[PDB]
Amino acid sequence: PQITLWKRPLVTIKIGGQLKEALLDTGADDTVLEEMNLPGRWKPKMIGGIGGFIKVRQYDQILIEICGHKAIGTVLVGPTPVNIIGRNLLTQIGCTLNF
């Protein structure tokens, strides 16, 4: 698609046979979701944003589909108000910014 930005760029994703919604976020280095039962154990990680820093759970090798585009990578679970697809996955679907 070619997605204009007059509203938040929310798209449908699929993770572990659950459809969710998430934000295509070029200002995010990593991908951050609020929840899921991603397979078991996790490693702690720090991430920062505008307000300061937060601890997240890092899960590796996570299969995710973004508008039907298959991808695999690291997904953080943390206190984000919106699910965030960051650059680590945006690159895998060949997402570019254009103007």
Ligand X SMILES: CC(C)[C@H](NC(=O)[C@H](C)NC(=O)OCc1ccccc1)C(=O)N[C@@H](Cc1ccccc1)[C@@H](O)[C@H](O)[C@@H](Cc1ccccc1)NC(=O)[C@@H](NC(=O)[C@H](C)NC(=O)OCc1ccccc1)C(C)C
Ligand Y SMILES: O=C(O)Cc1cc2ccccc2s1
Contact footprint for its own copies (CB under 8 A): 1-6, 8-9, 23-29, 32, 47-54, 67, 69, 78-81, 84, 87, 90-91, 93-99
Q: Which does 30 bind (CB under 5 to 8 A by kind): ligand Y, ligand X, its own copies, none?
A: ligand X
Annotate 29-48 with b (16+ C-beta within 10 A) or e (fewer). Answer: ebbbbeeeebeeeeeeeebe
Give me the least distance between CB of 84 and ligand X, in Å please.
5
Q: Return the residue of 11, 13, 22, 25 that touches ligand X, per CB under 6 A.
A: 25
Contact flag: residue 55 with ligand Y (CB under 6 A): yes
Provide the terminal-to-terminal Cα distance of the chain, rounded to the nearest Å: 15
Q: Is 25 a catalytic residue?
A: yes
- Strand partners of residue 77: 33, 57
> Amino acid letter at 60?
D
